[PDB]
Design an enzyme around this catalytic site. Structure first.
Site, mmCIF file in Angstrom:
data_model
loop_
_atom_site.group_PDB
_atom_site.id
_atom_site.type_symbol
_atom_site.label_atom_id
_atom_site.label_comp_id
_atom_site.label_asym_id
_atom_site.label_seq_id
_atom_site.Cartn_x
_atom_site.Cartn_y
_atom_site.Cartn_z
ATOM 1 N N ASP A 145 5.609 75.206 91.632
ATOM 2 C CA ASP A 145 5.756 74.187 90.611
ATOM 3 C C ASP A 145 5.590 72.834 91.314
ATOM 4 O OD1 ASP A 145 7.021 72.415 88.671
ATOM 5 O OD2 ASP A 145 7.953 74.213 87.586
ATOM 6 N N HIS A 148 -0.564 77.705 80.224
ATOM 7 C CA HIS A 148 0.120 76.439 80.404
ATOM 8 C C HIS A 148 -0.805 75.411 81.059
ATOM 9 C CE1 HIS A 148 3.314 73.628 80.967
ATOM 10 N NE2 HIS A 148 3.297 73.749 82.301
HETATM 11 C C1 HEM Z 1 9.067 74.664 80.435
HETATM 12 C C2 HEM Z 1 9.209 74.555 81.736
HETATM 13 C C3 HEM Z 1 8.005 74.232 82.554
HETATM 14 C C4 HEM Z 1 7.650 75.019 83.629
HETATM 15 C C5 HEM Z 1 8.537 76.110 84.201
HETATM 16 C C6 HEM Z 1 6.420 74.540 84.141
HETATM 17 C C7 HEM Z 1 5.769 75.101 85.213
HETATM 18 C C8 HEM Z 1 4.557 74.725 85.658
HETATM 19 C C9 HEM Z 1 3.763 75.380 86.634
HETATM 20 C C10 HEM Z 1 4.139 76.606 87.424
HETATM 21 C C11 HEM Z 1 2.576 74.717 86.791
HETATM 22 C C12 HEM Z 1 1.433 75.085 87.748
HETATM 23 C C13 HEM Z 1 1.594 74.453 89.157
HETATM 24 C C14 HEM Z 1 1.571 72.964 89.086
HETATM 25 O O1 HEM Z 1 0.447 72.346 89.088
HETATM 26 O O2 HEM Z 1 2.690 72.406 89.025
HETATM 27 C C15 HEM Z 1 2.637 73.578 85.924
HETATM 28 C C16 HEM Z 1 1.587 72.666 85.790
HETATM 29 C C17 HEM Z 1 1.643 71.651 84.851
HETATM 30 N N1 HEM Z 1 2.589 71.407 83.948
HETATM 31 FE FE1 HEM Z 1 4.236 72.449 83.644
HETATM 32 N N2 HEM Z 1 6.022 73.512 83.339
HETATM 33 C C18 HEM Z 1 6.906 73.262 82.330
HETATM 34 C C19 HEM Z 1 6.854 72.292 81.334
HETATM 35 C C20 HEM Z 1 5.883 71.295 81.256
HETATM 36 C C21 HEM Z 1 5.806 70.221 80.271
HETATM 37 C C22 HEM Z 1 6.858 70.011 79.188
HETATM 38 C C23 HEM Z 1 4.640 69.488 80.555
HETATM 39 C C24 HEM Z 1 4.020 68.274 79.991
HETATM 40 C C25 HEM Z 1 4.513 67.537 79.035
HETATM 41 C C26 HEM Z 1 4.017 70.118 81.701
HETATM 42 C C27 HEM Z 1 2.864 69.625 82.337
HETATM 43 C C28 HEM Z 1 2.237 70.231 83.378
HETATM 44 C C29 HEM Z 1 1.048 69.647 83.927
HETATM 45 C C30 HEM Z 1 0.355 68.353 83.577
HETATM 46 C C31 HEM Z 1 0.636 70.528 84.875
HETATM 47 C C32 HEM Z 1 -0.545 70.410 85.828
HETATM 48 C C33 HEM Z 1 -1.780 71.049 85.114
HETATM 49 C C34 HEM Z 1 -3.094 70.986 85.943
HETATM 50 O O3 HEM Z 1 -3.851 70.039 85.891
HETATM 51 O O4 HEM Z 1 -3.463 71.870 86.720
HETATM 52 N N3 HEM Z 1 4.826 71.160 82.110
HETATM 53 N N4 HEM Z 1 3.850 73.653 85.212
HETATM 54 O O LIG Z 2 5.287 71.277 84.778
#
Ligand code: HEM
Ligand SMILES: [O]
Ligand code: HEM
Ligand code: HEM
Ligand code: HEM
Ligand SMILES: [Mg+2]
Ligand SMILES: [Mg+2]
Ligand SMILES: [O]
Ligand SMILES: [O]
Ligand SMILES: [O]
Ligand SMILES: [O]
Ligand SMILES: [O]
Lengths: 306, 306, 305, 306, 306, 305
Positions: F145, F218
């Protein structure tokens, strides 16, 4: 700035150097990999932050550049020039792509190398693979501290990164690699004082020999170059020991980065062809170059946008 | 107690394994080096304390023992036994001396290996040299945590060190080595759940699969052996990944220590020959053994005083 | 039973050596401090765990022993014996108490030394105070790795701690200290090869010279001693560099622990008086001893009462 | 930019301060050393990277400047001014050169000091040598955290480095040193609350006392100075404890850097001469200054070019 | 012969304390988990070696013992005894199992707690869960160093582990837990000197107050107990701060191990019921016990064999 | 203008504190805001350089109007509830945010104690979460993450207000949501199915290729390009938290961006879906129980109050 690759890395104690040639028909596969290499660096490296310090600098050769890319060439890019000295020779060997992978541990280097080569299987042929490790007090295989006079901070940025002299390629650099094997038996037959005369610095304390004692054919004397401006011309080195005890291979993998290859090439001509007061660099009496290649390492943004 | 060699080492992240044969006429050179190997370990290691954790375990094969020493043989010492199974084969390859060199950094391993082989030049012939590196989560090349169920403390001493059953050689141990190469392409075509069924443990969390789900031909099932009294027979392993990305070599260097080779040999028979309920260890469908040797690693006092 | 002081310390990179004499009338103040010194060690050091590695070994000299205690004396306790060699002299200098304070950082050493001396104000007179620092690759002031052949583990326990031969004092040890000043200008005029011939080991790689090339008057040759049964007699050393650039003082503070002083004294006789094949230890041609004292370091339980 | 010396060092836990005067005829020897002092810093320090953090800041006094150099003087360079207060005195003592050597370990400081003084033997007379050590939670000899309100980053650069107001000497700084000895017995007779009133901050938690309760003659009150333009005038300090338990010497070595000495001199006037609301800084009732000198620390390029 | 659990742990900076009751019918599920808890400790912890220092000590209460096992009871096992003092009360609260989980990082503690509770859900009901953290330089929430006079090495083994007095249970220990909440507002209204009189040691330097000045109702005075033979009775404590800023909860989680509960219970009687010279431990005027339980922590082999 | 420490180094511990301002508490709050940087230095300095303690302070829309007069940040509004066909993003009360990070929890806790000590009687706590890094930057679903967060200049450009709202340059907008996970449901999926939910490989953290990455993963739904073809990016520092006894396993989401439009677009795509995706599959295993938006002003704005 445009964003450079991680040419100016923190000190790292492990490296993999991978040099490959691009097979006929491999160009599209290579272009796809170049556009993903930064995301692979993050995928392997992020989870090991902040200690891992994994980075990958990707370089492209002169003939490869022509096969891969449409338009303008970096001004200084050309094939490595063989030097045929009276005694010693710097050979030119094939290489289209360089991956200079560094980290605080070899496993991270290996994991990223595995991912890169996984994507390139069938499009490239390996030419060289070296697994380097630093000795614990920054020594090389001849027993001398290696890196001391490298530039630091702003002086490093100015010596290594292309700027307004070639503005389409600003933030790039030029890398020269040479794999050296050493004759350790011969070297260990010299007294310490004689070894110090070859290098130009004290062995234990790494203090430079004074100008009245430093020989003209010492390594430090011949690789000290002043420009037309009176100022020092500098490169950034990250030389790595490597070897195999069973095969009696004890090596230094030389890599030097500079904003133009002219600086590096001048140093090499002085080492191999000599000057008015020196036949050649004495270090070459104990060191044989078995590879030699020149690469341009573009800005990170250049690779992202393919 | 007699003082053992450092068979029970702390966790180390780098290793060199060196296997050599003794040339005719080389016996006296070897004997002199054996009596100095502990002092060389201190010379290379002391200045990097306490982080370095450099150790060298020295082992001697069955045929070599008879060339070097007269008098008693260790009771369990014999040449590695080839296993010609219905599908898989464990080969026996030549080896007179083993140096198992471990540290927290590869440079210390290499420096000690250089000193040892420098003394043996012209008396021995290298058969194998592997530079191993641990992955950052104690994982092996198949992506599983490797070492979890090794014994520790008193249980380890009891499992690995010769005692009153062979009192002249108390404090020694028996080492079996095998170099394995993996078919990574095939392995990565399995789902994680299928891989877990091969090993017998969960991949991400390293929890053992319960008895009702763990297959009889899983690696953990076949290498679990109980002795006459219903207690587990244990060995001490320090397996190390190694490889070369250009040659597509991805490997595990197996080394297992035990107070008698019978324990290790039982495990190998189960793996390669199979049992009534298991054709063979499923790990061997993705792993090929290319070396196999058995060595006795004497107590440190034995080496000092000859 | 008995818990030794921290004679077998991990590697530490800083030390304070404090040697004092007990003034007339100071005996009771000293006895009170001795019974608290382990609790002071914990007070200063516990909060810096686990990196601090602070310890204090306390030693008592032969004349001081008679002033402080009655009943049995440790069998080997006597004043340091001057050696008047043909060329070099090992001097004996006054000292009743030794505090050998070690840690990973000088501030912790100083904090504990401050508390100890705070309690002893008015009862003791300082004779010597040295602030030692190890170089980063375990090198000493002569540029050589220092500590390599020290015993470890069980061999160290057996070499350093009094046992059944003097059971009332089991768990103690005997410390010899000497402060050495070096002639660095002379030393640096030798080639590395010549320096290696003085010490008996290679300078850069710390490998021992082979028997056929190691000189008989090298330091390692003369401090290698075998006992009646052919086995090696060992001591535990923790030599520390010290100095002052302004005063041109470049020094090695020698401290050696052993289960009996006979071992240490034999090594000193070999160094200063020579053998049949060696006039003296060549290291003494670059090193002058300006102090010399012998102390018994009792088991920690002995001091707790 | 010109490159400053390492005035803005990371936190270091050991220091050597060396103050010397230049003897008759010593100027040429001094000038040679000044032009090599950066290369000695790299020689001693590079092999201990990245932990060592060794640096040396070199400063030159007012009288010395005129012996060593001709041409322009830095605008603010003058001899330290004695302050002869009603109760307390800030003394002036001789000093032509300052070497402020810092590292993570004392041995590195000592090694560099050895090389510097080795080159100056017979040209200089030592006036002061102090070996300083920080307590483990950044506390000083009085038991208070020391360093908290130093400026950092851009604010530090702006407070410490000469700029456009004296452009020939841009990138330099002005250092004031004073050696203080403390009356620890008196200090320890105060309650913690009384000590907090002397300093102006809480002892255990290092939180500043509020303006409504902080006394006018507290250290923090008197060393807070606003300039004509309403903004805070800042210096950069790196105070170090030192002492000797046998001699009952417990000390603070004060060193303060600023872009002009007027800032530091104003603070000293407030401390020693007092204000309308405060007779003097209460810290001086427990601290006696026994040295006092002022130096200019030029940009690194200025020294390189001699 | 017998292997204790990791009662004598190195210093760890994070802990989870989990206290549960066994529901009717849950006994078999609990017994299966007890026999696997060592394996789970290895599964979670091995991959973080050697830095992780993860351990779990498992304890069983008096009433639970009779539900789980038949045959011998440990001699000292009984329910925690309520102490109804004139002012202060030590309450007894329910608890059948204790898991005292320690590591150098909270994530490892949490991961192991997750695995344990995963196996037990449906068989147990949580009564208390506390996440503890080390606060500064081994300080507790009252600002004093906590742990200074713990026994170490041999003295610790002798104070904590059951031996020949109860040979069937040799290698076990008895744990007493009490969760304390502090009145920080009241405590911070004391001067430091008054706080030192409550504890019995100096606050900043952790030096014990001399016998001349230490009050009889100080914490250190009342928790110092000598046995009939003149020797000190010792326990091993590993108190952990915990809390929540928004709820104003600032806590000390007390855990004390001893070879017999009589030592711990004597200390508690002195604290809560007083002596001839002291009404109660003054620390209780700022600390309220809200839990209290006693557990036997068997030798590790006792749990393995179920 | 100097920003607050929105771009922090990687830290392994955090406290998130959300409070409401009681009637009459405004002046107490304003005094605290002007001291919060001093408190950060006082608690943190003695643990430098390892401590890496920082506190980012944010102010909600309704609170801003109570505390300050004049011009307001252009994008500041209350968090917008999203009522999707299946999943809902709730809005919960919050006037002030303290996002406290360090390499150790004790530093976070010490600073939170000082801040709340000053605000006693002026604020009411709404949420307090003590977060910890889990292994090798993994979250409670077992995935790395943080990987695709922007770094360096790209991060500065994505998070800091500039010339589009010049009076507030150097500020940022923080969105917080506390999520609880249904771990039992999640662990019933195969690893390959979990990878299809996230859009990356579990063990190696390599992104799935475009031909296999689902539209409702996601990563697919939180990848957004602007009209000019460039990636719209936020900076996240999500922290695991939980309680094993209550079976609560959570992710505390915090996302910083130069305008809330970027973050809100990502949220709409997740909760309300697109043409090709009903909603983000991660929400089938994750329930939001808080939601708040804050403006984090430039450090000099707070200093000058
Ligand atoms: C519900 C709990 C959440 C979990 C456990 C979670 C987990 C993750 C994971 C594992 C990734 C892939 C690795 C990384 O690039 O960080 C990721 C990417 C991402 N998440 Fe989340 N996330 C959550 C909620 C959110 C929310 C609410 C948003 C935005 C409002 C968000 C926006 C993003 C963005 C922008 C990326 C990068 C995408 C990319 O360009 O590759 N996340 N998240
Ligand atoms: O995230
Ligand atoms: C066998 C190959 C080599 C070895 C073992 C080696 C080793 C060293 C050593 C020990 C130093 C002194 C310490 C330092 O400043 O790093 C040094 C300096 C240097 N080497 Fe090499 N070197 C090699 C090849 C080269 C080559 C091929 C070049 C240029 C094309 C080069 C350029 C330099 C330069 C520029 C310096 C710094 C001189 C100065 O300004 O002081 N080296 N090298
Ligand atoms: C390709 C070669 C091998 C690989 C990659 C490998 C890998 C592993 C792994 C991942 C585990 C589970 C975790 C652990 O307890 O370490 C394991 C367990 C084990 N392996 Fe191997 N192994 C190999 C060869 C062998 C061989 C040749 C033997 C025996 C002669 C062996 C004996 C064991 C034993 C005894 C265990 C412990 C089983 C138990 O009691 O749970 N391994 N191995
Ligand atoms: C006598 C020995 C000295 C000691 C032990 C000492 C100690 C301290 C301490 C404990 C602080 C509070 C924390 C901090 O560093 O911000 C401090 C602050 C300071 N000291 Fe000193 N100090 C000494 C001398 C001086 C001198 C001589 C000057 C100026 C010439 C000075 C200037 C300052 C300044 C400017 C501050 C920061 C005030 C602010 O809060 O804005 N100090 N000193
Ligand atoms: Mg239930
Ligand atoms: Mg559930
Ligand atoms: O080089
Ligand atoms: O294994
Ligand atoms: O020594
Ligand atoms: O200061
Ligand atoms: O305690």
């Amino acid at each position: 700035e445009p964003e450079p690759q991680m040419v100016l890395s923190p000190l790292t104690s492990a490296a993999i150097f991978l040099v490959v040639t691009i097979d006929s028909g491999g160009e599209d596969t290579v272009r796809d990999l170049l556009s993903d290499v930064a995301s692979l660096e993050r995928a392997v490296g992020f989870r090991a932050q902040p200690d891992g310090r994994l980075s990958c600098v990707t370089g492209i050769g002169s003939e490869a550049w022509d096969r891969l890319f449409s338009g303008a060439r970096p001004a200084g890019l050309h094939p490595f020039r063989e030097l045929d000295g009276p005694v010693h020779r710097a050979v030119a060997t094939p290489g289209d792509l360089l991956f200079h992978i560094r980290a605080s541990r070899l496993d991270l280097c290996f994991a990223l190398a595995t991912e890169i080569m996984g994507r390139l299987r069938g499009a490239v042929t390996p030419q060289d693979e070296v697994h380097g490790f630093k000795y614990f007090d920054e020594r090389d295989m001849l027993g001398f501290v290696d890196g001391t006079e490298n530039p630091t901070g702003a002086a490093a940025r100015r010596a290594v990164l292309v700027g307004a002299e070639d503005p389409a390629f600003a933030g790039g650099s030029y890398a020269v690699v040479q794999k050296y094997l050493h004759d350790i038996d011969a070297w260990e037959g010299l007294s310490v004082e004689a070894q110090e005369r070859v290098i130009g610095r004290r062995k234990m304390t790494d203090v430079e020999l004074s100008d009245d004692v430093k020989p003209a054919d010492s390594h430090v004397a011949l690789t000290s170059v002043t420009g037309p401006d009176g100022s020092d011309l500098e490169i950034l080195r990250d030389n790595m020991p490597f070897g195999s005890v069973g095969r009696e291979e004890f090596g230094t993998y030389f890599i030097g980065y500079a904003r133009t290859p002219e600086v590096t090439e001048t140093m090499l001509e002085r080492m191999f062809l000599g000057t008015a007061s020196a036949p050649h660099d004495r270090i070459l009496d104990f060191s044989t170059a078995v590879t030699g290649s020149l690469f341009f390492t573009p800005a990170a943004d250049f690779l992202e946008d393919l």
